[PDB]
Amino acid sequence: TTATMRQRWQAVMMNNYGTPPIALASGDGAVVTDVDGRTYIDLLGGIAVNVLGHRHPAVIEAVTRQMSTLGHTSNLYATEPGIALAEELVALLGADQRTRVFFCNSGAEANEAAFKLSRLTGRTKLVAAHDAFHGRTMGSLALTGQPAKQTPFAPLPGDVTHVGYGDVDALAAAVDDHTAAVFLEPIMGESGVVVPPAGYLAAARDITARRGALLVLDEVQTGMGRTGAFFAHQHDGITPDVVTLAKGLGGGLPIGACLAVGPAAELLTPGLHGSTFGGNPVCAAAALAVLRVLASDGLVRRAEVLGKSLRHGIEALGHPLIDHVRGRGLLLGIALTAPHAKDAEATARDAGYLVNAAAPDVIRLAPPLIIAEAQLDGFVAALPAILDRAV
Amino acid sequence: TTATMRQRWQAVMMNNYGTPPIALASGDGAVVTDVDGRTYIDLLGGIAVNVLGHRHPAVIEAVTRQMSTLGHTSNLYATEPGIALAEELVALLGADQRTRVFFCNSGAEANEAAFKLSRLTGRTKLVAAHDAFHGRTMGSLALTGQPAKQTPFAPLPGDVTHVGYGDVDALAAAVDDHTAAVFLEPIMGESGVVVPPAGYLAAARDITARRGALLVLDEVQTGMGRTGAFFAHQHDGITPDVVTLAKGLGGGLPIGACLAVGPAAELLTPGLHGSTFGGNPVCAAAALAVLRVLASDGLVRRAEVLGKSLRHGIEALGHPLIDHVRGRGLLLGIALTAPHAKDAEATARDAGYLVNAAAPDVIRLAPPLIIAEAQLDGFVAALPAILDRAV
Ligand SMILES: O=C(O)c1cc2ccccc2cc1O
Ligand SMILES: O=C(O)c1cc2ccccc2cc1O
């Protein structure tokens, strides 16, 4: 039962997450079932990870085949899946200069790799945005712009300056010839699906290039085609110096990547970085399968179409609790006129939908890219009652 | 072909590992096969990760079963495998106070969690050993005692003091009432399987206890039953405040853990730490299978028995290049009288064996716990010619 599972959790787990309110038993596609038999339509994807939902046959096949061929070896040895995955990610980025890949296990680790890259420029100053999220390890936590998550762990590694997200003048003023790198999410996810103004990413690219700073785009949450281009920054026609990926990269299997373009790709020399599990054949095979399905089923273009319709349906409700809808593709935020997002998360759960109160007044959606339009339509139809009950 | 695979590696991978000398295509048990069809007996286990070797049926079964049931959910939801794994790990530690578990993806992340735990004591000073290896992310790299690997990324998170490993009075002098934590490997793996003097870990436990500092034992490489006890520190009759695990924990699947005992288990409160993939059902299911097999097949005792026989066999060779063999169970270092370990790595490869030159004069072995006695016997018999060819 849910009570029994929660009691077991509380007896053994550290309390860094609190106690989960529901205990899940099974999942298939975009539908999960708790241990008491209740079903839920998953509009959150385990926080943007389950790009292909649960039990996707291509991921299952890839993992099973690879485990029956060759498992972990470490990077003392070259293995096919990681090399092929690196080739595919480089092709997807489409940079004009040579691009090189480092594999790791998580978004924090990918940003730690980028942090270490920035040190090799000879500069130690870094710029990120207030309310940005880049991970929880000591280096990535310094880049994260969330004082609540940071101050108990001070001092953090330096020297980071945080500026208002989307503020071109503030960014131009903070970046100078001592700035190693600027880290930006193309849409701030954890903060509440905060989309920057038109032209902001292009300004960031110009500012950084002019001052010799690396532009690092954290695509851990916005990548994997979620916004209707493989990398969200591709909507703005820029090429950053470094891109980080994780979350949906392995369709559920733990894997992250740091891609570096041009001179930044040559900064790491032998012995200067590594990760034991990085690039392992099983997780790389899963990620290769995810890329294959995204391509074969046209899921990147589909995410744009479904997200546009979803945004319009929510806006068409005219519900007084909804201030506006924001995001792109299948990363969407419902900004509320009053801080009832946590209550709306609960009432959505009662109605069988998994959503996220990303901020007191923002409901975040990040559904599997395989979600059916009917499931999105059903959520839109359920939303007025969900919101009425929240207040 | 090896040349084509290595050329593909060099075209796309960052150069932080150099270029691997061989490309592996398949593995089964303790035997791996390269792309040219050559077989090698794996005495390194992918750097102590493949505790059950490749294609172990219990791991394959657990992973395939869980993938066909429920994949990643995130820790917004309670799920069975992670809870059960935490329960099993707490039982194996056998501490007398309540122990709590945090899951992550890697050894670096496990030590980052411990690093952040130590911040919550109210102190910022940390002590580790010269030549210790604790990971490559910014926080874990500050603990790692390798200036050549740390200097390029300075400044690192503070305030860390390094002391000579095994030196009781040096540790006592460095630990004071401002020390948050001492980090120690029970045997220094990366440095060359450096075993501390008898009583040293117990002295570290006493020194930290008297000064109010946490004792953090990094069992990422020494754990998983490799030394003949589940945790290597259990040979010494102490209970640390924090234990970190990774590498072999998932039999190859990426997973790490931070266990904290007593008051240290309560430091992390809701929202203060997390990892998206941490505790996911698939990797936790693999780890549970590893624990089941270690117990059912008596592999922890087997590691002690085979380790003793292996050490005795190598020493019985009376080879002039071998100074001594050190370590415990199936973590062994062959310490040489001259710096030919790197050459011996290549000549061992020529003879069909994968070993590691951990230091210029130390060959490290960490074979799967399922390795055949005859596979070890063949290595010992081949070792004289391997060393003669190396010189
Ligand atoms: O994790 C590491 O730091 C690492 C470094 C290497 C350095 C040279 C070759 C292989 C390596 C494999 C690793 O996992
Ligand atoms: O990685 C995190 O920081 C994280 C924090 C949580 C905090 C509360 C509940 C669930 C959470 C899940 C996460 O992955």
PDB file of C-alpha atoms and ligand atoms in Angstrom, chain A residues 16-17 47 133 136, chain B residues 75-76 271 273-276, ligand 2:
ATOM      1  CA  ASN A  16      16.529  15.536   1.266  1.00  0.00           C
ATOM      2  CA  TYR A  17      13.379  15.054  -0.884  1.00  0.00           C
ATOM      3  CA  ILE A  47      11.021  15.866 -14.610  1.00  0.00           C
ATOM      4  CA  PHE A 133      19.376  25.644 -12.069  1.00  0.00           C
ATOM      5  CA  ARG A 136      23.660  20.206  -7.015  1.00  0.00           C
TER       6      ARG A 136
ATOM      7  CA  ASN B  75      12.261  11.053  -6.299  1.00  0.00           C
ATOM      8  CA  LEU B  76       8.971  12.892  -6.521  1.00  0.00           C
ATOM      9  CA  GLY B 271      15.157  20.573  -0.710  1.00  0.00           C
ATOM     10  CA  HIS B 273      20.145  18.008  -2.068  1.00  0.00           C
ATOM     11  CA  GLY B 274      19.096  15.728  -4.895  1.00  0.00           C
ATOM     12  CA  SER B 275      20.026  14.001  -8.149  1.00  0.00           C
ATOM     13  CA  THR B 276      17.474  13.501 -10.928  1.00  0.00           C
TER      14      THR B 276
HETATM   15  O1  LIG C   2      17.461  16.812  -8.036  1.00  0.00           O
HETATM   16  C1  LIG C   2      16.811  17.502  -7.217  1.00  0.00           C
HETATM   17  O2  LIG C   2      17.310  18.567  -6.758  1.00  0.00           O
HETATM   18  C2  LIG C   2      15.435  17.031  -6.759  1.00  0.00           C
HETATM   19  C3  LIG C   2      14.848  17.664  -5.676  1.00  0.00           C
HETATM   20  C4  LIG C   2      13.584  17.247  -5.227  1.00  0.00           C
HETATM   21  C5  LIG C   2      12.991  17.883  -4.119  1.00  0.00           C
HETATM   22  C6  LIG C   2      11.742  17.465  -3.674  1.00  0.00           C
HETATM   23  C7  LIG C   2      11.084  16.424  -4.307  1.00  0.00           C
HETATM   24  C8  LIG C   2      11.677  15.790  -5.392  1.00  0.00           C
HETATM   25  C9  LIG C   2      12.935  16.213  -5.858  1.00  0.00           C
HETATM   26  C10 LIG C   2      13.523  15.566  -6.956  1.00  0.00           C
HETATM   27  C11 LIG C   2      14.770  15.980  -7.400  1.00  0.00           C
HETATM   28  O3  LIG C   2      15.335  15.316  -8.495  1.00  0.00           O
END
